[model samples]
Target: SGAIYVGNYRVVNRHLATHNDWANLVWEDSSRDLLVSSTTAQGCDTIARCDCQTGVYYCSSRRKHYPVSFSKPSLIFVEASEYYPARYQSHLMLAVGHSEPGDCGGILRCQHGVVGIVSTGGNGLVGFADVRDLLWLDEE
Candidate 1:
């Protein structure tokens, strides 16, 4: 019941980048979740960019002073678990936390329980703050 729909990787990242220095973003499904051992939880789950050439991935969730490695980069996302999509709830949270004047227009409606920022030409969608993750921001 506390799931959030993480659509595009941009909007989710932008918002997280703004407040990422203090919090680590983690993801969870019905079975297991992403766990961390340090206090730096900011941007722990959001991918910033992919660099396949040098094999160096740039992301907000990067571990401090540690190089990112993948057992099988080719199968990075080949398998995934299904969770209850929380579109509307995440949209509302984003609007309340980050939306500005006329940012998305109107009261931020949802289509089929999914609310996201449509592209200017309506070509793509920038989704709301939705996903199953932990917001652990170290204050010490």
Candidate 2:
């Protein structure tokens, strides 16, 4: 599960100043159950640990805001929760709303019961979405 993957980074106006706002993409194993936070759920759990694969994640200074794309994220992966490896599901629900209580928005997807936490900070903290079959372990 600790494999290195290369991916792309978005350099926008936020990176023009000393503050670094690079997209820190990651694949996380959130403790919250998938069903607990759905398109109709109330709350969602956030991931604690993350593994960075590629991209100029942390920038100390403001560099030229160039749309540089990196080949990362493809390396990191989630070990299918059970016997379903190749079989994927897209029942992903991102932790949406405000700080206290919010709904998991944006239908995300992934293969197997493996969901990737897109980013660590900011509003981009969205999870992957998977199909129905790839959601639960029993389905496989």
Top lDDT hit: 2
Q: What is the lDDT of candidate 2?
A: 0.23
Clashes of each: 8, 22
Which pairs of residues clash in candidate 1, taking residues 3 or more apart in a chain or in different chains?
A: 4-130, 4-131, 5-130, 23-41, 23-42, 24-41, 24-42, 43-61
- For candidate 1, the C-alpha RMSD (Å) to the true structure equals 18.2
Q: How accurate is candidate 1 locally (lDDT)?
A: 0.22
Q: Give lDDT tens digits, candidate 1, residues 107-140.
A: 1122222222211111221112222123221211
What C-alpha root-mean-square deviation, in Å, does candidate 2 show against the real structure? 17.7
True-vs-predicted CA distance for residue 50, candidate 2, Å: 20
TM-score of each: 0.18, 0.18
For candidate 2, the 10 contiguous residues with the lowest summed lDDT are 1-10
Tens digit of per-residue lDDT, candidate 2, span 37-102: 112222232221223222112211222111122222322333343323432233233333221112
Task: For candidate 2, give the lDDT of residue 77.
Answer: 36
Q: Candidate 2: which stretches are off by over 4 Å?
A: 1-30, 36-105, 110-123, 129-140
lDDT of 1 at 11: 28
Q: Tell me the lDDT of model 2 at 83.
A: 24
